Design a protein around this ligand. Structure first.
Ligand code: ZN
Ligand code: ZN
Ligand code: ZN
Lengths: 270, 71, 111, 104, 46, 66
């Protein structure tokens, strides 16, 4: 309850998904928030891989791509500086995290390599970043590659800050459900009925949640979309609530940067 | 007789920070450096990129004028 | 390979400015503002907020080509009203709405 | 692919890194990536007209040897993954190299 | 050259020179492969 | 060759679900759909990632290495 701005209502919450309803908000703001949440949150991922010995049956580029696709902890990501903005040669402790992976084949059977085998050799300085995310009952994590007896894998990886816009490996959200107006009260779409619209088109699960069914009343031309049902799913690097908070913060920061640029250009003009 | 010829180098600053490449051609203050992971050629100032050893070791700045060797 | 660098669509290059305003001679009190490194995300919000105003007679935006991350925004206001003032008001309203939404979401998640 | 083909008796090609001192009409591609045996070790990134196999043939003023190296293709580049060296039926040297690239 | 020739189905780090024939001292195979390079091999995940 | 780390369409991480999928297929004798539902893959975009995956890594591992 803060002013007459947008209102929220959380339906279901979990460790990986959050369900909420957006009210008293325009469609453009919700779409911008969704776009920011899917392609603007800064995260941490492996960007540079140095290979020493690779005797496995997989190519070096294959393993590099697989390692770059592995999610990493990014809770304290605001304390890490961008590599381009950092005063260093390649990477230091204040702008990157170094991880080393060593695998060897001892047993006769196949020896799998998991994301839990990654070891952080850099200094985190107390920051909660760089730890691989293991959401599994067995605790093994993401499978990287399989090697038999004799084969040896040894490489070093460097993790750097980035956003999903540059590469899809930096995206913290998997899929975001967006829906509004479960009934066709706004007439924003025309259905493809062959015999009847109601029977052929299944009813959405959000029909019961508010939005009473329409009657034979005249069409309302003064109504606008103001209620939105959203479900945000997180990969695991960032909590869902933190994902939404960081999306709102990023949108606010972008608008504030636009305002600052406008003020600077006004001052320069005068 | 340029020293920065056929030597493994690492690009610092700019948008190619941390990349590994080998110098190919030098044109005055600008030098053409290839890329290992990326299949493209980029031109940057020779005084910017650091210099490494062919086998591998410590990296140094453009101070290689006083020591016409690798590393 | 002619593929452009991925960071070129969201990083401001040397010699480039984020904002660039040109007066419009087609209609009085009309200006054209060119943004850089933005892809519809601020454009839709800014256009909607400007249209929400009562002193703004025209507000539209377009992206000339998907290859380049840049859109042009045209604002025409009523007599005696500076379009830059309208843009500042829209930005301030957006900031206030986003802050209120963030506070409400945090309060809802806390319980 | 390349072979150490032999002309007559004494006119036999050899696999070695050519030098400017005694090689004439040689290619302008880079020879830094070459080794003493004349082959590029696996794991070395190559591009452009870089020479992968270094072969020279005797001429018969000095310059007794003339290069016969085969450069990489102009539009192709990548990292060498496997280099194979063996002998043909008669007993000369047989050399095969491979280049690996990813096409996004 | 030296320490740069691995025999097939042997995995032996036998070394050659400009005069030795192309063969393995354990099995006698006529096919050999270069082990690897000692230079830096770095890839980007992007 | 090996299971993709992330789903191509949305981006859900499925790298640890292959072993569990095989175990559910070979211990509990469940059909593919029930195992997929148990693993948590709801959208068919994620379902197709592991439902139609070929494990060619074992065939490569069959050959004797160096
Ligand atoms: Zn740094
Ligand atoms: Zn042998
Ligand atoms: Zn999916």
């Amino acid at each position: 309850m803060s002013e007459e701005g947008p209102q929220v209502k959380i339906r279901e919450a979990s460790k990986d998904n959050v369900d909420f309803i957006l009210s008293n908000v325009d469609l453009a703001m919700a779409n911008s928030l969704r776009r920011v949440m899917i392609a603007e949150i800064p995260t941490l991922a492996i960007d540079s891989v140095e290979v020493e010995t690779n005797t496995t049956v997989l190519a070096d580029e294959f393993i590099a791509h697989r390692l770059g696709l592995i999610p990493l902890q990014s809770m304290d990501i605001e304390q890490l500086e961008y590599s381009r903005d950092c005063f260093c040669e390649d990477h230091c402790d204040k702008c990157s995290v170094v991880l080393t992976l060593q695998a060897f084949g001892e047993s006769e059977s196949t020896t799998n390599v998991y994301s839990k085998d990654l070891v952080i050799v850099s200094n985190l300085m107390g920051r909660n970043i760089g730890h691989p995310i293991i959401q599994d009952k067995e605790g093994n994590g993401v499978l990287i590659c399989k090697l038999r007896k004799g084969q040896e894998l040894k490489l070093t990886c460097v993790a750097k800050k980035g956003i999903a816009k540059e590469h899809a490996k930096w995206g913290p959200a998997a899929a975001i459900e967006f829906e509004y107006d479960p009934w066709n009260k706004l007439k924003h779409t025309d259905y493809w009925y062959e015999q009847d619209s109601a029977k052929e088109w299944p009813q959405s699960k959000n029909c019961e949640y508010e939005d009473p069914p329409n009657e034979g009343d005249p069409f309302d031309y003064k109504a606008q979309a103001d209620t939105f049902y959203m479900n945000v799913e997180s990969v695991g690097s960032i909590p869902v609530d933190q994902v939404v908070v960081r999306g709102i913060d990023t949108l606010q920061k972008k608008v504030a940067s636009i305002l600052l640029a406008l003020t600077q250009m006004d001052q320069d003009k005068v | 007789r340029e020293v920065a010829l056929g030597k493994t180098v690492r690009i610092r600053s700019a948008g190619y920070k941390g990349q590994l490449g080998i110098v190919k051609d030098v044109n005055g203050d600008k030098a053409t450096v290839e890329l290992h992971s990326k299949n493209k050629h980029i031109t940057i100032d020779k005084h910017k990129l650091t210099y490494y050893n062919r086998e591998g070791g410590e990296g140094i700045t453009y101070d290689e004028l006083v020591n016409r060797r690798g590393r | 390979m002619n593929a452009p660098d991925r960071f070129e669509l969201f990083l401001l290059g040397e010699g480039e400015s984020k904002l660039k305003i040109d007066p419009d001679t087609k209609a009085p009190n009309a200006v054209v503002i060119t943004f850089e490194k933005e892809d519809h995300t601020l454009g839709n919000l800014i256009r909607a907020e400007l249209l929400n105003d009562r002193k703004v007679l025209f507000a539209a935006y377009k992206v000339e080509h998907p290859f380049f991350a840049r859109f042009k925004l045209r604002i025409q206001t009523t007599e005696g009203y500076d379009p830059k003032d309208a843009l500042k008001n829209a930005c301030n309203s957006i900031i206030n709405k986003l802050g209120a939404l963030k506070t409400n979401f945090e309060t809802e998640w806390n319980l | 692919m390349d072979q150490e083909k032999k002309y007559g008796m004494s006119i036999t090609e050899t696999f070695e890194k050519p030098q400017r001192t005694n090689t004439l009409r040689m290619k302008h591609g880079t020879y830094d990536k070459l080794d003493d045996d004349g082959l590029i070790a696996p794991g070395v990134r190559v591009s452009g007209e870089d020479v992968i196999i270094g072969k020279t043939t005797p001429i018969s003023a000095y310059h007794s040897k003339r290069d016969a190296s085969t450069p990489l293709r102009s539009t192709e580049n990548g990292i060498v993954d496997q280099v194979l060296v063996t002998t043909n039926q008669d007993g000369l040297k047989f050399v095969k190299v491979r280049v690996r690239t990813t096409k996004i | 050259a030296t320490l740069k020739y691995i025999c097939a189905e042997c995995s032996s780090k036998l070394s050659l020179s400009r005069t030795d024939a192309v063969r393995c001292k354990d099995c006698g195979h006529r096919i050999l492969l270069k082990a690897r390079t000692k230079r830096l091999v770095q890839f980007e995940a992007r | 060759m090996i299971v993709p780390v992330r789903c191509f369409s949305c981006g859900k991480v499925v790298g640890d679900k292959w072993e569990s999928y095989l175990n559910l297929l070979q211990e509990d004798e469940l059909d593919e759909g029930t195992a997929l539902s148990r693993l948590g893959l709801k959208r068919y975009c994620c379902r197709r990632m592991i439902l139609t995956h070929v494990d060619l890594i074992e065939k490569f591992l069959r050959y004797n290495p160096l």
